[PDB]
Design a protein around this ligand. Sequence first.
Ligand SMILES: Nc1ncnc2c1ncn2[C@@H]1O[C@H](COP(=O)(O)OP(=O)(O)OP(=O)(O)O)[C@@H](O)[C@H]1O
Ligand SMILES: Cn1c(=O)c2c(ncn2C)n(C)c1=O
Ligand SMILES: [Ca+2]
Ligand SMILES: [Zn+2]
Lengths: 96, 421, 58
Amino acid sequence: VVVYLYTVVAFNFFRKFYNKSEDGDTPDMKCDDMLTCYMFHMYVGVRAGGGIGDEIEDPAGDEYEIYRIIFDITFFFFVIVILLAIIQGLIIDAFG
Amino acid sequence: AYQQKLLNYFARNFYNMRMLALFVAFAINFILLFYKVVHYVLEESSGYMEPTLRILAILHTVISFFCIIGYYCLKVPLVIFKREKEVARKLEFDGLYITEQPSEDDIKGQWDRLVINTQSFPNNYWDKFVKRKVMDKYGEFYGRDRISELLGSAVLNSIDVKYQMWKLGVVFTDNSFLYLAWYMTMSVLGHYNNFFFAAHLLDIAMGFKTLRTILSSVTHNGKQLVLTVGLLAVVVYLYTVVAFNFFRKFYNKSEDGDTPDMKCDDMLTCYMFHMYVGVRAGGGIGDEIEDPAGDEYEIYRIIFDITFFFFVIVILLAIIQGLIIDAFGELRDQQEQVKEDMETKCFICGIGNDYFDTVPHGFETHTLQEHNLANYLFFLMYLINKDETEHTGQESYVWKMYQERCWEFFPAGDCFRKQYE
Amino acid sequence: YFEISESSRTQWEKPQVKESKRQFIFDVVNEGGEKEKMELFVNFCEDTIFEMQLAAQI
Ligand SMILES: Nc1ncnc2c1ncn2[C@@H]1O[C@H](COP(=O)(O)OP(=O)(O)OP(=O)(O)O)[C@@H](O)[C@H]1O
Ligand SMILES: Cn1c(=O)c2c(ncn2C)n(C)c1=O
Ligand SMILES: [Ca+2]
Ligand SMILES: [Zn+2]
């Protein structure tokens, strides 16, 4: 759910940051359609370790940059530091 | 009557209903994933989905409205009771609107001054003498005519409008009704848009038991948590002061002088760099920084490289995580402790667990056939319907004890067989 | 020994008030002193009568 609620944020409000191109050489691929944002997030942004701020472009001088870091930090420590660890904290006790 | 019978259908079917309003709120957010970009819906399974999301957003909104109609009939007379009771007890026993005159604190306690004046002030309290008792009680210290001044088609201007404005006041303070009003408009504001419509997944969290477990776990574990998050903002800042005064030339985001190289050492853009990059790195700071090659600060570079790592990432980040892993640990431990500090000891006799397992299978018999708190509720109902003349020796010794508010008569810790045999 | 009624027997089994038992059970087996616990139990018992009167209007 909380991954999906971040997908709703990025697709409505942050959608131009996703690129898999070699700076316009390839006809640049997107990850902001309806589902290919979400299936991108749960496949990449979970396993990253840097949250979402590792397979995404950099906020340079944009007018969304202050709202970019808030989305950058609170993706991290709400999903990776907290929500992934208490998943692991169960099975470590469930084998216990 | 059909207006009344259909309204009585809603208060009957309430918990049945909101369980369905969750299941619809999945079905939008199972379908709202089918966008493409202006925003438009595609199709893979059914040819038509623009009809479904049109009809469901109407079907959701009325079912959101059939709860707030049903809740106004069902639980509002309960909350109109427990409000009206605690006024009439305190005005009779200590007389706060006669003697204490309550201050600016607890405004809602001072809100109940538009109701003591009205006619129907014991509307649902089964006790219509709260006006006459206090005039009987406090007419010796205060004037009785002061007290009576203090107390007291064809129907549209022949109803107590001053009572309803107080009745509207005690409704809007209630939290559960307030949540239903917000859950109504977020169906209506999710009819303009549809992405500020997915705030109906909040119903997953805000149940009942999982709500008061969180509010207990916050007051028990929040003050430690914030001040350990607040510690992390300091020791990052104390490293920012070090790097900006003493190490500032190492930060680059250029392709070796091709771009007119960007810096991160001004005043704040060192610090906002550190807490955005150096925390989430895993290699501390030594991953988005240049290499100490042969510099005369290289020995002081590695010290800043190691002691950024294991003071912030290995230690300070882990004991942040070590709290919330335990703070969710009380979200299962607390609801289980209720279910097992109820089965050890009984409610009223308070005896315990072993003392009715010494006989074969006795604790269910000692509870469900001797003490059984519902039977005590059925007892207090029994003195109500029974006439006052007909009470026996027990049922009038109890009933006079219950009038004078005593409660010595409960079997405190010495239930029946613990004195017999 | 006394007489539990018939209509008052089914109405406590109604899920209308079977919720209100479960909220009251949860709030006294938690923190609260036993010198006022039975005080709180009777204040539960007074309003639980009032839910029986509503469920008779059904
Ligand atoms: N004085 C008491 N009166 C009644 N039940 C008691 C008392 N003391 C302890 N209990 C325990 O409370 C339990 C309530 O029954 P149980 O929880 O199994 O069914 P329920 O009440 O319908 O379920 P729920 O609690 O979910 O409503 C009983 O098992 C009983 O062991
Ligand atoms: C009239 N009446 C009472 O007088 C009463 C009561 N509960 C306690 N008392 C004292 N109930 C439910 C009641 O209806
Ligand atoms: Ca008699
Ligand atoms: Zn008992």
